């Protein structure tokens, strides 16, 4: 009763078929695992310039 | 180890064409100057006293 079971931009057929972007991991091909990025930032150093 | 700046090229520094094996500016010309930091090429790239 849902065209997008996982709630992501890709329908159940596009996911199961692999007809979406080719850089999406293969676990996100089944309709119950969301194709979904988890992006975070990390600081490596901080530099101060006295005015 | 300190990244002073990361600068995306502005209108002054964009190359229109670049074919395989070519170079911008073409071979026989001089290098292009990357001397501005902001979006409209109105601010220069500064460094500290220690740098």
Short mmCIF file of C-alpha atoms in Angstrom, two decimals:
data_model
loop_
_atom_site.label_atom_id
_atom_site.label_comp_id
_atom_site.label_asym_id
_atom_site.label_seq_id
_atom_site.Cartn_x
_atom_site.Cartn_y
_atom_site.Cartn_z
CA UNK A 1 0.00 0.00 0.00
CA UNK A 2 3.10 2.22 -0.08
CA UNK A 3 5.12 3.09 -3.16
CA UNK A 4 8.12 4.10 -1.01
CA UNK A 5 8.22 1.64 1.88
CA UNK A 6 11.37 2.98 3.54
CA UNK A 7 10.30 6.60 3.10
CA UNK A 8 13.29 7.63 0.98
CA UNK A 9 13.22 9.27 -2.47
CA UNK A 10 13.26 5.90 -4.28
CA UNK A 11 10.30 3.61 -4.87
CA UNK A 12 10.29 -0.06 -3.93
CA UNK A 13 10.91 -1.07 -7.53
CA UNK A 14 13.79 1.36 -8.09
CA UNK A 15 15.50 0.08 -4.95
CA UNK A 16 14.90 -3.63 -5.53
CA UNK A 17 15.85 -3.34 -9.21
CA UNK A 18 18.94 -1.22 -8.64
CA UNK A 19 17.69 1.36 -11.14
CA UNK A 20 18.78 4.26 -8.92
CA UNK A 21 22.21 5.88 -8.46
CA UNK A 22 25.02 3.36 -8.78
CA UNK A 23 26.99 4.71 -5.81
CA UNK A 24 24.31 3.61 -3.34
CA UNK A 25 25.45 0.69 -1.20
CA UNK A 26 23.86 -2.64 -2.05
CA UNK A 27 22.18 -3.07 1.33
CA UNK A 28 20.00 -0.07 0.46
CA UNK A 29 18.59 -2.10 -2.43
CA UNK A 30 16.03 -3.79 -0.40
CA UNK A 31 12.85 -1.82 0.28
CA UNK A 32 13.20 -1.98 4.08
CA UNK A 33 16.63 -0.31 4.39
CA UNK A 34 16.65 3.42 3.70
CA UNK A 35 19.08 4.87 1.19
CA UNK A 36 20.26 7.60 3.47
CA UNK A 37 23.49 9.56 4.11
CA UNK A 38 24.88 10.18 7.58
CA UNK A 39 27.25 13.14 7.19
CA UNK A 40 29.29 14.64 10.00
CA UNK A 41 32.13 17.10 10.41
CA UNK A 42 35.27 16.80 12.49
CA UNK A 43 37.77 19.48 13.46
CA UNK A 44 41.47 18.75 13.01
CA UNK A 45 43.01 22.00 14.29
CA UNK A 46 42.12 25.59 15.11
CA UNK A 47 44.27 28.58 14.17
CA UNK A 48 44.11 31.99 15.87
CA UNK A 49 45.07 35.31 14.27
CA UNK A 50 45.41 38.13 16.78
CA UNK A 51 43.94 41.41 15.53
CA UNK B 1 49.80 21.39 8.53
CA UNK B 2 47.63 24.46 8.68
CA UNK B 3 45.33 25.00 5.73
CA UNK B 4 45.44 28.75 5.19
CA UNK B 5 42.49 28.91 2.80
CA UNK B 6 40.33 26.85 0.50
CA UNK B 7 39.18 28.92 -2.45
CA UNK B 8 36.70 27.98 -5.14
CA UNK B 9 37.65 29.70 -8.38
CA UNK B 10 35.68 32.82 -9.26
CA UNK B 11 34.82 34.31 -12.66
CA UNK B 12 38.38 35.56 -13.11
CA UNK B 13 39.86 32.08 -12.62
CA UNK B 14 37.38 29.87 -14.52
CA UNK B 15 38.60 28.06 -17.62
CA UNK B 16 36.03 27.89 -20.38
CA UNK B 17 37.40 24.91 -22.32
CA UNK B 18 39.87 22.23 -21.29
CA UNK B 19 40.34 19.34 -23.70
CA UNK B 20 42.13 16.09 -22.84
CA UNK B 21 45.87 16.68 -22.88
CA UNK B 22 45.39 20.45 -22.99
CA UNK B 23 46.02 22.99 -20.24
CA UNK B 24 44.45 26.26 -19.11
CA UNK B 25 45.99 28.70 -19.81
CA UNK B 26 47.20 27.01 -22.99
CA UNK B 27 50.81 26.00 -23.47
CA UNK B 28 52.81 29.10 -24.31
CA UNK B 29 50.81 31.42 -22.06
CA UNK B 30 51.53 32.45 -18.50
CA UNK B 31 49.90 30.99 -15.38
CA UNK B 32 46.75 32.57 -14.04
CA UNK B 33 46.69 34.49 -10.77
CA UNK B 34 44.61 33.17 -7.88
CA UNK B 35 44.66 36.18 -5.58
CA UNK B 36 41.12 36.64 -4.21
CA UNK B 37 39.14 34.74 -1.62
CA UNK B 38 35.50 35.82 -1.76
CA UNK B 39 32.71 35.23 -4.24
CA UNK B 40 33.02 38.50 -6.18
CA UNK B 41 36.83 38.76 -6.42
CA UNK B 42 36.90 41.78 -4.12
CA UNK B 43 38.90 40.49 -1.12
CA UNK B 44 42.51 39.32 -1.02
CA UNK B 45 43.95 36.23 0.69
CA UNK B 46 45.53 37.18 4.06
CA UNK B 47 48.06 35.48 6.32
CA UNK B 48 49.16 35.99 9.94
CA UNK B 49 52.31 37.43 11.40
CA UNK B 50 53.55 33.96 12.34
CA UNK B 51 52.69 32.56 8.92
#
